């Protein structure tokens, strides 16, 4: 009759009750008619099944007429149909247990551990909100440093669903790049999580950057890493950079400005292995604002040519759109307009303005 889905390793309780609110003889048996457990008077007799260790019941509820079956540390092989048997009639409850696990061959792989004969579909939403839908196995092909939060995968079989949450951590100096898109005036955050092997190890590093003008490459800061302690060697006055003393390599820019935009290289070396490690970082900045009757929206930094800028009212359609670096509207209709720099599928930057 009943249908229960479970998380692998979690604990679920199967509710059986009888009409008479008294202690009476009963037992449980699985799909193969194997005794799970029974009661002999006051005592509880254990069944011969391979579920012997984990399956259990609560004797507190036997007087009240409830006869629950408790299974802790669920396994996929536990998923089966179970039967509560009081000598008069039998109540039937079907159990499916799923599980989610993460492999790694930069790139990540997820496998959904499933019981036999199931027909499940699995959608998965990123921390930023990107949805990745798949079948029994999902593949996270390309990862950027920004999208490294707690991911949430919801698994659905027919009409019943189960939620899984798992963390993704993207290593900095691997081939994955870092990029941040900010509207003007916002504080900028860059994080470079270190691999657990080198986190204790010691080295030195610095960050080179290039602005709107390519005349000079500023080389913002030089810093030293000993034990798990980050100390700064030199900082430029121009960006008021903050380097975290704490071990997670954290760098903060006080507020985003157009001049503070462009590609950069962060280089970390280590006295141990003396092999130069590099990492690529980009910052793209949007300015969307109205001067008197004019409305102007420009974007600065290294953006792929393929993306497109648009100005549009949220009620109507795009009043102007080009794939260039700057967009301007004169005497625009009254309303709350918006400026978007976006690729084909998603909007990278959106700014909301009032005319």
């Amino acid at each position, epitope marked *: 009759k009943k*249908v229960v889905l479970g998380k692998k390793g979690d604990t679920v309780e199967l509710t059986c009750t009888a009409s008479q609110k008294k202690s009476i003889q009963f037992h449980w048996k*699985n*799909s*193969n008619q194997i005794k799970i457990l029974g009661n002999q008077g006051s005592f509880l007799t254990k069944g011969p099944s391979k579920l012997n260790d984990r399956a259990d019941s609560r004797r507190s509820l036997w007087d009240q007429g409830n006869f629950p079956l408790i299974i802790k540390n669920l396994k996929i*092989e*536990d*998923s*089966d*149909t179970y039967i509560c048997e009081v000598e008069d009639q039998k109540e039937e409850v*079907q159990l*499916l247990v799923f599980g989610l696990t993460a492999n790694s061959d930069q790139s990540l792989t997820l496998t959904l551990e*499933s*019981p*036999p*004969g*199931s*027909s*499940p*579909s*699995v*959608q998965c939403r990123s921390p930023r909100g990107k949805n990745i*839908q*798949g*079948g*029994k196995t999902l593949s996270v092909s390309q990862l950027e440093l920004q999208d490294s939060g707690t991911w949430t995968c919801t698994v*659905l*079989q*027919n*009409q*019943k669903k189960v939620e899984f949450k798992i963390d993704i951590v993207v290593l900095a100096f691997q081939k994955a790049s870092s990029i941040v898109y900010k509207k003007e005036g916002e504080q900028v955050e860059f994080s470079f999580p270190l691999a657990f092997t080198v986190e204790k190890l010691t080295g030195s590093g610095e960050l080179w950057w290039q602005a709107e003008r390519a005349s000079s490459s500023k080389s913002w800061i030089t810093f030293d890493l000993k034990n798990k302690e980050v100390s700064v060697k030199r900082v430029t006055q121009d960006p008021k950079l903050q380097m975290g003393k704490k071990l997670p390599l954290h760098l903060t820019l006080p507020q985003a400005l157009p001049q503070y935009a462009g590609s950069g290289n962060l280089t970390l070396a280590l006295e141990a292995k003396t092999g130069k490690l590099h990492q690529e970082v980009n910052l793209v900045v949007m300015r969307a604002t109205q001067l008197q009757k004019n409305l102007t929206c420009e974007v600065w930094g290294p953006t792929s040519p393929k993306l497109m800028l648009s100005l549009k009212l949220e009620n109507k359609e795009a009043k102007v759109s080009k794939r260039e670096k700057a967009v301007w509207v004169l005497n625009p209709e009254a309303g709350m307009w918006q400026c978007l720099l976006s690729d084909s599928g998603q909007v990278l930057l959106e700014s909301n303005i009032k005319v």
Partner: antibody
Amino acid sequence: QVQLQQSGPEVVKPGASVKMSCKASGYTFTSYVIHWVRQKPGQGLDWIGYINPYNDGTDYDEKFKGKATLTSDTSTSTAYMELSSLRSEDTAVYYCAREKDNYATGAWFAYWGQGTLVTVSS
Amino acid sequence: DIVMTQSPDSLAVSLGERVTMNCKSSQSLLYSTNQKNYLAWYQQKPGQSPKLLIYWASTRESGVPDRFSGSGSGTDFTLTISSVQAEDVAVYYCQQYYSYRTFGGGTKLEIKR
């Protein structure tokens, strides 16, 4: 009396996509999983994919990971499948089927459609 | 995937005789918990769609007559037609539902008169 009725035969240009249909009647359309099978002329059955009508959940076989697209219209109670960039080989007969019961109790294809013949030609 | 293989290519059987049709799977289809084989058998008479014959590898559908019987366990399964009637000229397929859903190549049963 559970019926499964598919489209009629069709002609589709090479490279064009064919969207075919499968109309269900006699049960709660969102309560059981739908499957698609391809059979080429006088050849074995090739499993393609399965769609859950409840949320339009999707999983396909690797051979058809690009080609096969399964959607369902819950109101009309119909399941569709479309193949993209049809090739000469792809001329075949496609069936839609249903699981006997839900939640792994019955996963064998018990109720079947009549078949749709798509002649890939110009 | 799970590779299913059906032998023979085609079969010639005389009237009233006993039919044996084999389906061997890549990996096992037996589920340890509920001791059920996740395998099924199907008939397709010419010009028609396939028809369900055996589910769980040991049980037949209500419409199915009594002469068909399913046998085997694990990885080696067999369909047996007790006495071939003239009307059983068809091609029979086997399918697994343990993981995903894969079929066989097929055995054509032809009667020798």
